[PDB]
Amino acid sequence: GIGAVLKVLTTGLPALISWIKRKRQQ
């Protein structure tokens, strides 16, 4: 539980920001 949310959500943060910025700009 804690290890899954930490290794999946508490690891990749700039990837989601780059996907929303590339989908909003491009």
Side-chain angles (χ1 to χ4, degrees):
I2 189 82
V5 284
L6 201 78
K7 268 82 178 181
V8 178
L9 280 147
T10 328
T11 44
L13 262 88
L16 293 153
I17 320 304
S18 296
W19 265 92
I20 52 99
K21 280 185 173 176
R22 283 180 178 179
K23 274 184 168 285
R24 215 179 181 178
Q25 288 180 33
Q26 286 179 270

PDB file of all heavy atoms in Angstrom:
ATOM      1  N   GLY A   1       0.828  -1.238   0.000  1.00  0.00           N
ATOM      2  CA  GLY A   1       0.000   0.000   0.000  1.00  0.00           C
ATOM      3  C   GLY A   1       0.843   1.260   0.000  1.00  0.00           C
ATOM      4  O   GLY A   1       0.890   1.981  -1.004  1.00  0.00           O
ATOM      5  N   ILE A   2       1.528   1.510   1.129  1.00  0.00           N
ATOM      6  CA  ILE A   2       2.389   2.694   1.298  1.00  0.00           C
ATOM      7  C   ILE A   2       3.571   2.691   0.299  1.00  0.00           C
ATOM      8  O   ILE A   2       3.952   3.746  -0.226  1.00  0.00           O
ATOM      9  CB  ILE A   2       2.887   2.819   2.789  1.00  0.00           C
ATOM     10  CG1 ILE A   2       3.591   4.166   3.046  1.00  0.00           C
ATOM     11  CG2 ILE A   2       3.794   1.656   3.202  1.00  0.00           C
ATOM     12  CD1 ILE A   2       2.642   5.317   3.323  1.00  0.00           C
ATOM     13  N   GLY A   3       4.119   1.493   0.033  1.00  0.00           N
ATOM     14  CA  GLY A   3       5.236   1.344  -0.899  1.00  0.00           C
ATOM     15  C   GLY A   3       4.822   1.522  -2.354  1.00  0.00           C
ATOM     16  O   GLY A   3       5.624   1.964  -3.184  1.00  0.00           O
ATOM     17  N   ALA A   4       3.556   1.189  -2.650  1.00  0.00           N
ATOM     18  CA  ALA A   4       3.002   1.315  -4.002  1.00  0.00           C
ATOM     19  C   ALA A   4       2.684   2.777  -4.335  1.00  0.00           C
ATOM     20  O   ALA A   4       2.996   3.248  -5.432  1.00  0.00           O
ATOM     21  CB  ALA A   4       1.758   0.448  -4.144  1.00  0.00           C
ATOM     22  N   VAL A   5       2.083   3.493  -3.369  1.00  0.00           N
ATOM     23  CA  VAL A   5       1.732   4.915  -3.546  1.00  0.00           C
ATOM     24  C   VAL A   5       2.977   5.819  -3.491  1.00  0.00           C
ATOM     25  O   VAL A   5       2.966   6.931  -4.026  1.00  0.00           O
ATOM     26  CB  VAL A   5       0.683   5.411  -2.507  1.00  0.00           C
ATOM     27  CG1 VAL A   5      -0.704   4.904  -2.873  1.00  0.00           C
ATOM     28  CG2 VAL A   5       1.036   4.995  -1.076  1.00  0.00           C
ATOM     29  N   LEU A   6       4.045   5.316  -2.850  1.00  0.00           N
ATOM     30  CA  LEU A   6       5.306   6.053  -2.715  1.00  0.00           C
ATOM     31  C   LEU A   6       6.195   5.871  -3.954  1.00  0.00           C
ATOM     32  O   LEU A   6       6.823   6.828  -4.418  1.00  0.00           O
ATOM     33  CB  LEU A   6       6.047   5.588  -1.447  1.00  0.00           C
ATOM     34  CG  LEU A   6       7.090   6.560  -0.868  1.00  0.00           C
ATOM     35  CD1 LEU A   6       6.421   7.693  -0.094  1.00  0.00           C
ATOM     36  CD2 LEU A   6       8.063   5.812   0.031  1.00  0.00           C
ATOM     37  N   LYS A   7       6.225   4.640  -4.490  1.00  0.00           N
ATOM     38  CA  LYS A   7       7.037   4.316  -5.672  1.00  0.00           C
ATOM     39  C   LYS A   7       6.326   4.648  -6.995  1.00  0.00           C
ATOM     40  O   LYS A   7       6.961   4.632  -8.055  1.00  0.00           O
ATOM     41  CB  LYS A   7       7.427   2.830  -5.652  1.00  0.00           C
ATOM     42  CG  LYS A   7       8.765   2.535  -4.972  1.00  0.00           C
ATOM     43  CD  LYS A   7       8.635   2.451  -3.455  1.00  0.00           C
ATOM     44  CE  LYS A   7       9.965   2.109  -2.802  1.00  0.00           C
ATOM     45  NZ  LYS A   7       9.845   1.989  -1.323  1.00  0.00           N
ATOM     46  N   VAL A   8       5.021   4.949  -6.932  1.00  0.00           N
ATOM     47  CA  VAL A   8       4.246   5.283  -8.137  1.00  0.00           C
ATOM     48  C   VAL A   8       3.848   6.771  -8.153  1.00  0.00           C
ATOM     49  O   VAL A   8       3.822   7.390  -9.223  1.00  0.00           O
ATOM     50  CB  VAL A   8       2.978   4.377  -8.284  1.00  0.00           C
ATOM     51  CG1 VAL A   8       2.145   4.747  -9.513  1.00  0.00           C
ATOM     52  CG2 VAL A   8       3.372   2.905  -8.366  1.00  0.00           C
ATOM     53  N   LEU A   9       3.544   7.337  -6.977  1.00  0.00           N
ATOM     54  CA  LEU A   9       3.139   8.745  -6.880  1.00  0.00           C
ATOM     55  C   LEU A   9       4.228   9.628  -6.268  1.00  0.00           C
ATOM     56  O   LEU A   9       4.369  10.791  -6.655  1.00  0.00           O
ATOM     57  CB  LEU A   9       1.848   8.874  -6.068  1.00  0.00           C
ATOM     58  CG  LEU A   9       0.558   8.566  -6.834  1.00  0.00           C
ATOM     59  CD1 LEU A   9      -0.473   7.940  -5.908  1.00  0.00           C
ATOM     60  CD2 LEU A   9      -0.005   9.833  -7.470  1.00  0.00           C
ATOM     61  N   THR A  10       4.993   9.077  -5.316  1.00  0.00           N
ATOM     62  CA  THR A  10       6.059   9.836  -4.649  1.00  0.00           C
ATOM     63  C   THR A  10       7.418   9.634  -5.352  1.00  0.00           C
ATOM     64  O   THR A  10       8.471   9.598  -4.704  1.00  0.00           O
ATOM     65  CB  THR A  10       6.166   9.449  -3.148  1.00  0.00           C
ATOM     66  OG1 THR A  10       4.875   9.096  -2.631  1.00  0.00           O
ATOM     67  CG2 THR A  10       6.735  10.599  -2.319  1.00  0.00           C
ATOM     68  N   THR A  11       7.378   9.527  -6.686  1.00  0.00           N
ATOM     69  CA  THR A  11       8.588   9.341  -7.492  1.00  0.00           C
ATOM     70  C   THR A  11       8.533  10.161  -8.783  1.00  0.00           C
ATOM     71  O   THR A  11       9.509  10.830  -9.136  1.00  0.00           O
ATOM     72  CB  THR A  11       8.824   7.855  -7.845  1.00  0.00           C
ATOM     73  OG1 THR A  11       7.596   7.243  -8.256  1.00  0.00           O
ATOM     74  CG2 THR A  11       9.405   7.100  -6.656  1.00  0.00           C
ATOM     75  N   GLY A  12       7.389  10.101  -9.474  1.00  0.00           N
ATOM     76  CA  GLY A  12       7.215  10.838 -10.718  1.00  0.00           C
ATOM     77  C   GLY A  12       6.245  11.996 -10.577  1.00  0.00           C
ATOM     78  O   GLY A  12       5.031  11.812 -10.709  1.00  0.00           O
ATOM     79  N   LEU A  13       6.790  13.187 -10.312  1.00  0.00           N
ATOM     80  CA  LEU A  13       5.984  14.399 -10.146  1.00  0.00           C
ATOM     81  C   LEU A  13       6.091  15.346 -11.362  1.00  0.00           C
ATOM     82  O   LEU A  13       5.055  15.824 -11.833  1.00  0.00           O
ATOM     83  CB  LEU A  13       6.380  15.144  -8.860  1.00  0.00           C
ATOM     84  CG  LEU A  13       5.483  14.891  -7.640  1.00  0.00           C
ATOM     85  CD1 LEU A  13       5.961  13.676  -6.856  1.00  0.00           C
ATOM     86  CD2 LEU A  13       5.448  16.121  -6.746  1.00  0.00           C
ATOM     87  N   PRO A  14       7.325  15.650 -11.905  1.00  0.00           N
ATOM     88  CA  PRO A  14       7.476  16.558 -13.068  1.00  0.00           C
ATOM     89  C   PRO A  14       6.963  15.964 -14.388  1.00  0.00           C
ATOM     90  O   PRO A  14       6.814  16.687 -15.379  1.00  0.00           O
ATOM     91  CB  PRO A  14       8.993  16.804 -13.157  1.00  0.00           C
ATOM     92  CG  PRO A  14       9.566  16.278 -11.885  1.00  0.00           C
ATOM     93  CD  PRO A  14       8.652  15.171 -11.454  1.00  0.00           C
ATOM     94  N   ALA A  15       6.685  14.649 -14.389  1.00  0.00           N
ATOM     95  CA  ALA A  15       6.183  13.949 -15.582  1.00  0.00           C
ATOM     96  C   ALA A  15       4.725  14.315 -15.874  1.00  0.00           C
ATOM     97  O   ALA A  15       4.352  14.523 -17.033  1.00  0.00           O
ATOM     98  CB  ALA A  15       6.330  12.442 -15.412  1.00  0.00           C
ATOM     99  N   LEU A  16       3.913  14.412 -14.808  1.00  0.00           N
ATOM    100  CA  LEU A  16       2.491  14.773 -14.924  1.00  0.00           C
ATOM    101  C   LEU A  16       2.330  16.257 -15.269  1.00  0.00           C
ATOM    102  O   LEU A  16       1.420  16.634 -16.017  1.00  0.00           O
ATOM    103  CB  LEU A  16       1.745  14.447 -13.621  1.00  0.00           C
ATOM    104  CG  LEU A  16       1.616  12.952 -13.285  1.00  0.00           C
ATOM    105  CD1 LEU A  16       1.503  12.755 -11.782  1.00  0.00           C
ATOM    106  CD2 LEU A  16       0.410  12.339 -13.988  1.00  0.00           C
ATOM    107  N   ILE A  17       3.243  17.088 -14.728  1.00  0.00           N
ATOM    108  CA  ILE A  17       3.249  18.542 -14.974  1.00  0.00           C
ATOM    109  C   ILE A  17       3.660  18.828 -16.431  1.00  0.00           C
ATOM    110  O   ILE A  17       3.141  19.755 -17.063  1.00  0.00           O
ATOM    111  CB  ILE A  17       4.216  19.304 -13.999  1.00  0.00           C
ATOM    112  CG1 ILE A  17       4.158  18.746 -12.543  1.00  0.00           C
ATOM    113  CG2 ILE A  17       3.942  20.816 -14.009  1.00  0.00           C
ATOM    114  CD1 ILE A  17       2.778  18.721 -11.884  1.00  0.00           C
ATOM    115  N   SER A  18       4.587  18.000 -16.949  1.00  0.00           N
ATOM    116  CA  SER A  18       5.076  18.119 -18.328  1.00  0.00           C
ATOM    117  C   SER A  18       4.034  17.611 -19.333  1.00  0.00           C
ATOM    118  O   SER A  18       3.964  18.105 -20.462  1.00  0.00           O
ATOM    119  CB  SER A  18       6.384  17.344 -18.496  1.00  0.00           C
ATOM    120  OG  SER A  18       7.414  17.902 -17.698  1.00  0.00           O
ATOM    121  N   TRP A  19       3.221  16.629 -18.903  1.00  0.00           N
ATOM    122  CA  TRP A  19       2.161  16.054 -19.745  1.00  0.00           C
ATOM    123  C   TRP A  19       0.971  17.013 -19.871  1.00  0.00           C
ATOM    124  O   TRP A  19       0.370  17.127 -20.946  1.00  0.00           O
ATOM    125  CB  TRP A  19       1.698  14.708 -19.182  1.00  0.00           C
ATOM    126  CG  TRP A  19       2.388  13.530 -19.812  1.00  0.00           C
ATOM    127  CD1 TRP A  19       3.528  12.914 -19.379  1.00  0.00           C
ATOM    128  CD2 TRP A  19       1.993  12.828 -20.992  1.00  0.00           C
ATOM    129  NE1 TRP A  19       3.860  11.873 -20.223  1.00  0.00           N
ATOM    130  CE2 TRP A  19       2.930  11.786 -21.229  1.00  0.00           C
ATOM    131  CE3 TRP A  19       0.927  12.950 -21.913  1.00  0.00           C
ATOM    132  CZ2 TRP A  19       2.862  10.881 -22.307  1.00  0.00           C
ATOM    133  CZ3 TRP A  19       0.840  12.077 -22.987  1.00  0.00           C
ATOM    134  CH2 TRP A  19       1.798  11.037 -23.195  1.00  0.00           C
ATOM    135  N   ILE A  20       0.647  17.712 -18.766  1.00  0.00           N
ATOM    136  CA  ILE A  20      -0.458  18.690 -18.747  1.00  0.00           C
ATOM    137  C   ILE A  20      -0.055  19.997 -19.451  1.00  0.00           C
ATOM    138  O   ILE A  20      -0.900  20.676 -20.043  1.00  0.00           O
ATOM    139  CB  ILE A  20      -0.972  19.000 -17.306  1.00  0.00           C
ATOM    140  CG1 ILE A  20       0.170  19.391 -16.351  1.00  0.00           C
ATOM    141  CG2 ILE A  20      -1.742  17.811 -16.747  1.00  0.00           C
ATOM    142  CD1 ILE A  20       0.312  20.884 -16.158  1.00  0.00           C
ATOM    143  N   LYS A  21       1.250  20.329 -19.380  1.00  0.00           N
ATOM    144  CA  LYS A  21       1.797  21.534 -20.023  1.00  0.00           C
ATOM    145  C   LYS A  21       1.944  21.333 -21.535  1.00  0.00           C
ATOM    146  O   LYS A  21       1.790  22.283 -22.311  1.00  0.00           O
ATOM    147  CB  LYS A  21       3.151  21.904 -19.411  1.00  0.00           C
ATOM    148  CG  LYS A  21       3.038  22.647 -18.090  1.00  0.00           C
ATOM    149  CD  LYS A  21       4.398  23.096 -17.582  1.00  0.00           C
ATOM    150  CE  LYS A  21       4.266  23.984 -16.354  1.00  0.00           C
ATOM    151  NZ  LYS A  21       5.593  24.349 -15.784  1.00  0.00           N
ATOM    152  N   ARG A  22       2.235  20.084 -21.943  1.00  0.00           N
ATOM    153  CA  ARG A  22       2.384  19.729 -23.361  1.00  0.00           C
ATOM    154  C   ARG A  22       1.017  19.511 -24.023  1.00  0.00           C
ATOM    155  O   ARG A  22       0.873  19.693 -25.235  1.00  0.00           O
ATOM    156  CB  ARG A  22       3.248  18.473 -23.519  1.00  0.00           C
ATOM    157  CG  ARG A  22       4.737  18.729 -23.339  1.00  0.00           C
ATOM    158  CD  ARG A  22       5.550  17.455 -23.507  1.00  0.00           C
ATOM    159  NE  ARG A  22       6.990  17.703 -23.375  1.00  0.00           N
ATOM    160  CZ  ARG A  22       7.940  16.760 -23.467  1.00  0.00           C
ATOM    161  NH1 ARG A  22       7.629  15.485 -23.693  1.00  0.00           N
ATOM    162  NH2 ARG A  22       9.214  17.100 -23.334  1.00  0.00           N
ATOM    163  N   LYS A  23       0.021  19.128 -23.207  1.00  0.00           N
ATOM    164  CA  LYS A  23      -1.350  18.901 -23.687  1.00  0.00           C
ATOM    165  C   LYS A  23      -2.149  20.209 -23.721  1.00  0.00           C
ATOM    166  O   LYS A  23      -3.122  20.327 -24.473  1.00  0.00           O
ATOM    167  CB  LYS A  23      -2.067  17.883 -22.797  1.00  0.00           C
ATOM    168  CG  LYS A  23      -1.821  16.437 -23.198  1.00  0.00           C
ATOM    169  CD  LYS A  23      -2.628  15.478 -22.333  1.00  0.00           C
ATOM    170  CE  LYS A  23      -2.621  14.062 -22.897  1.00  0.00           C
ATOM    171  NZ  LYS A  23      -3.498  13.929 -24.093  1.00  0.00           N
ATOM    172  N   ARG A  24      -1.726  21.181 -22.900  1.00  0.00           N
ATOM    173  CA  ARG A  24      -2.381  22.492 -22.821  1.00  0.00           C
ATOM    174  C   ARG A  24      -1.751  23.490 -23.802  1.00  0.00           C
ATOM    175  O   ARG A  24      -2.438  24.383 -24.311  1.00  0.00           O
ATOM    176  CB  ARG A  24      -2.293  23.037 -21.392  1.00  0.00           C
ATOM    177  CG  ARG A  24      -3.509  23.845 -20.960  1.00  0.00           C
ATOM    178  CD  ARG A  24      -3.366  24.341 -19.531  1.00  0.00           C
ATOM    179  NE  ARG A  24      -4.541  25.099 -19.090  1.00  0.00           N
ATOM    180  CZ  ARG A  24      -4.697  25.623 -17.866  1.00  0.00           C
ATOM    181  NH1 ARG A  24      -3.757  25.483 -16.931  1.00  0.00           N
ATOM    182  NH2 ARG A  24      -5.805  26.289 -17.574  1.00  0.00           N
ATOM    183  N   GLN A  25      -0.443  23.331 -24.059  1.00  0.00           N
ATOM    184  CA  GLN A  25       0.289  24.215 -24.978  1.00  0.00           C
ATOM    185  C   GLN A  25       0.256  23.678 -26.414  1.00  0.00           C
ATOM    186  O   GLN A  25       0.028  24.442 -27.358  1.00  0.00           O
ATOM    187  CB  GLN A  25       1.743  24.391 -24.519  1.00  0.00           C
ATOM    188  CG  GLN A  25       1.897  25.257 -23.271  1.00  0.00           C
ATOM    189  CD  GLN A  25       3.343  25.418 -22.819  1.00  0.00           C
ATOM    190  OE1 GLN A  25       4.272  25.454 -23.632  1.00  0.00           O
ATOM    191  NE2 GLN A  25       3.539  25.516 -21.509  1.00  0.00           N
ATOM    192  N   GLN A  26       0.483  22.366 -26.565  1.00  0.00           N
ATOM    193  CA  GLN A  26       0.478  21.720 -27.881  1.00  0.00           C
ATOM    194  C   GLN A  26      -0.851  21.005 -28.139  1.00  0.00           C
ATOM    195  O   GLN A  26      -1.480  21.193 -29.181  1.00  0.00           O
ATOM    196  CB  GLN A  26       1.647  20.731 -28.003  1.00  0.00           C
ATOM    197  CG  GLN A  26       3.002  21.400 -28.174  1.00  0.00           C
ATOM    198  CD  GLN A  26       4.136  20.399 -28.276  1.00  0.00           C
ATOM    199  OE1 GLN A  26       4.732  20.015 -27.270  1.00  0.00           O
ATOM    200  NE2 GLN A  26       4.441  19.971 -29.495  1.00  0.00           N
TER     201      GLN A  26
END
